[PDB]
Design a binder for this molecule. Structure first.
Ligand SMILES: Nc1ncnc2c1ncn2[C@@H]1O[C@H](COP(=O)(O)OP(=O)(O)O)[C@@H](O)[C@H]1O
Ligand SMILES: [Mg+2]
Lengths: 379, 81
């Protein structure tokens, strides 16, 4: 009775594990009952927190709560993009011979970690999630990366797996795994043109692939700084303005209040994908003032309409580079947690002239699903 | 099933500079610096004076082998002077 291998979507903001068993993929829920886990690691006076536990105390402990390690893995400290990203992180990044390290306070001491060490802690959590479900230690894994990751980013992602005690069977591209989840290598219809529209929490990736006989990238486009976080921030700014009108106070320079507001906005945003209205409550938001309100789906769409519309531009750009008309895309695939937004789905569908789009696998799970299939094939 | 991720051996580039587009085709064993040299022949500007942009990181060097960048078949770049 041999141990299964797992597929891990090691995401910028959330990660997800699957396993293929008994002819079927299982996307594995953690001990909160949740099938995605925040790619977050936190360091306190007493312990190391991973996932939800880390993301839950980010407002109280921002200096020692690490995230976005995927923006650093395999990178050089002197990279302009790295230096640009560092201005937005509340944690310290330092230079070790042109290699960035994240520096925090941990059990009273100053400790510094390589990006692949931070990511190895996320991968450890994903490994432990799989082990709790399967009932035995897991040693083999496929891990996914963006198609545009270079050799150094791939090697450092694999290193993060080895540090977590995994045999990395293979690093594969995220859009490949998404296509695998939809059986797009198995249509039996000859060569197919596939567009992957991947809108997550921090990044937007458009990939055009051809697939023929299990052989899979013709063009890419997107925005590494457009994602669900930006939709959260449109809501934040909206309620900052509402708070000024109701109480004549400006909370935007209170970092704890803004982060607490951001958390609540992200939850309301998720609710707005299933309901047309959502309520929001934060006790002692600012100067002990309770904040409580609601927002409609329509109002949220209006606050984000330019951002939503901007997603079509990389689609047009990728189609131009691939020298393909939109009608020559045989399979359209929507993945990433933000593609659950109904307005986003409708804009893509209208753009592709009413076409029914591949959405029955949960879009924040399809990459782990395809990684799990690849893993089983390699055992 | 069997799953193969094929890296194209010939890379197509459309490089934008001001009003103008320069097409470049080379093997993925070539370096980024060889793109810049082709740009110098087409634009008559020294490679020393061009900032070649469009890569996904900011650590790409003239010596970087294109295969290591896992590029798509068709690429869009642009030049700043
Ligand atoms: N029901 C939902 N409605 C709207 N957005 C959602 C929903 N569920 C998740 N998201 C968003 O998806 C983003 C993360 O997507 P995901 O693909 O899981 O992570 P990553 O960015 O790591 O790829 C977050 O911004 C999250 O708020
Ligand atoms: Mg993800």
């Amino acid at each position: 009775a041999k141990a299964a291998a797992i597929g891990i979507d090691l995401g910028t903001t959330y990660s997800c594990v699957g396993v293929f068993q008994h002819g079927k993929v299982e996307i594995i829920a953690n001990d909160q009952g949740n099938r995605t886990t925040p790619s977050y690691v936190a360091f306190t006076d007493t312990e190391r927190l991973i996932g939800d536990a880390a993301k839950n105390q980010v407002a109280l402990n921002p200096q020692n709560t690490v995230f976005d390690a995927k923006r650093l893995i395999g990178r050089k400290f002197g990279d302009p993009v790295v230096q640009s990203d560092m201005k937005h992180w509340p944690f310290q990044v330092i230079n070790d011979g042109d290699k960035p390290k994240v520096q925090v306070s941990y059990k009273g001491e100053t400790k510094a970690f390589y990006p692949e060490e931070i990511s190895s802690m996320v991968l450890t959590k994903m490994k432990e999630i799989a082990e709790a479900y399967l009932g035995y230690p897991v040693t083999n894994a496929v891990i996914t990366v963006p198609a545009y990751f270079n050799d150094s980013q791939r090697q450092a992602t694999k290193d993060a797996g080895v540090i977590a005690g995994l045999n990395v069977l293979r690093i594969i591209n995220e859009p490949t795994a998404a296509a695998i989840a939809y059986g797009l290598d198995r249509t039996g219809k000859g060569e197919r043109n596939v567009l992957i529209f991947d809108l997550g929490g921090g990044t937007f990736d458009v990939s055009i692939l051809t697939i023929d006989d299990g052989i899979f990238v013709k063009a890419t486009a997107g925005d590494t700084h457009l994602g669900g976080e930006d939709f959260d921030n449109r809501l934040v700014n909206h309620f900052v303005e509402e708070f000024k009108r109701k109480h004549k106070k400006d909370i935007s320079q209170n970092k704890r209040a803004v982060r607490r507001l951001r958390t609540a906005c992200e939850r309301a945003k998720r609710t707005l994908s299933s309901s047309t209205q959502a309520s929001l409550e934060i006790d002692s938001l600012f100067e002990g003032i309770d904040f409580y309100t609601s927002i409609t789906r329509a109002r949220f769409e209006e606050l984000c309409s330019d951002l939503f519309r901007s997603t079509l531009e990389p689609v047009e750009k990728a189609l131009r580079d691939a020298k393909l008309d939109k009608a020559q895309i045989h399979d359209l695939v929507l993945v990433g947690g933000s593609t659950r937004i109904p307005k986003v789905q409708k804009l893509l569908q209208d753009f592709f002239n009413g076409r029914d789009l591949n959405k029955s696998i949960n879009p924040d799970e399809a990459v782990a699903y395809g990684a799990a299939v690849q893993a089983a094939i390699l055992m | 099933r069997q799953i193969v991720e094929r890296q194209p051996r010939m890379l197509d580039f459309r490089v934008e500079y001001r009003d103008r587009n320069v097409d470049v085709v080379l093997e993925d064993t070539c370096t980024v610096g060889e793109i810049k040299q082709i740009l110098e022949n087409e634009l008559q500007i020294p490679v020393s004076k061009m900032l070649l942009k469009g890569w996904k990181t900011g650590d790409v060097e003239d010596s970087t082998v294109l295969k290591s960048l896992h590029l798509p078949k068709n690429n869009s770049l642009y030049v700043l002077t």
